[model samples]
Target: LTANLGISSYAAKKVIDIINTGSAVATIIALVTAVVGGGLITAGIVATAKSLIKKYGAKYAAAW
Candidate 1:
């Protein structure tokens, strides 16, 4: 479960960084705001989690 969270956060930060570099002050804040507020970032993490759980089983959700 801990490692699961670690992976999720890693993906989250990775995405944030991806946009962080692309913006460089022109449209950085605007894009970050849009993605976070739009739940696009959350969707990716949730999608990853669902696949991980399906492979491992729901026993971990109980742990969570």
Candidate 2:
């Protein structure tokens, strides 16, 4: 209605409907990707840290 006044409400609502539907799907895919990526990155960092600590400690422990 702000374009040239509410002279084309039918056309505007039609386009808006399509946009609203598509935006939801795009938002969900992005959210899932972010969650999975975050989880994997965290797991990898923890596992790597533990492995490195153990490997290095085994060869360099003062008691060993």
Candidate 3:
């Protein structure tokens, strides 16, 4: 989670830079956004998985 938060913050910063600049800033921004977005998405998935595991069962949640 710490790692993910770091990556997301880095990405959001990069996106802000890109918004200020132009395509010249795109490479770094793209990479950063992908890392951050991916981390956030993974976090969401894990949270949902945990919720499902508790609500139903680990086996059922894992199967899904």
Candidate 4:
């Protein structure tokens, strides 16, 4: 057979297998974190905007 590269085919496959396994786990963690972060940030922004609008409207309406 022709000379194998620095590592054998089996070793190369094993390395690829390990990296794929780790990538799957990492992706799951990132997905969950993004979902949670996105929800909280959106809720917080909406609440803050509502409060500011109410406060400003009340103040200006009273002046009119």
Q: For this target, which candidate reaches the highest lDDT against the unseen true structure?
A: 3
Candidate achieving higher lDDT, 3 or 4? 3
lDDT of 4 by residue, 1-64 (tens): 0022233334333332332233343443344235333222233332332343356642222221
Over 4 Å off in model 1, which ranges? 1-11, 14-17, 38-64
List of clashing residue pairs for candidate 4: none
Candidate 4 segments exceeding 4 Å error: 1-5, 24-64
Candidate 2, overall lDDT?
Answer: 0.32
The TM-score of predicted model 1 comes to 0.29
User: Which scores better on TM-score, 2 or 3?
Assistant: 3
lDDT tens digits by residue: candidate 3, 1-64: 2233443444444433333333333343454346455434343434444455567755434343
The residue-by-residue lDDT of candidate 1 on 1-64, one tens digit each, is 2243333543445444544354343354445446445334344444443444467643442232
Clashes, model 4: 0
lDDT computed for candidate 3: 0.42
CA-lDDT, candidates in order: 0.42, 0.32, 0.42, 0.32
Instruction: Choose 1 or 2, whichever is better by TM-score.
Output: 1
Instruction: Please provide, for model 2 over 1-64, each residue's C-alpha lDDT reduced to its tens digit, 9 standing for 90 to 100.
Output: 1142222444333323332333344443344235333222233332332343357632222121
Lowest lDDT 10-mer window, candidate 4? 1-10
TM-score, model 2 to reference: 0.26
What is the Å distance of residue 13 in model 1 from its true position?
Answer: 2.6
TM-score of structure candidate 3: 0.36
Model 2, position 24, has a per-residue lDDT of 49
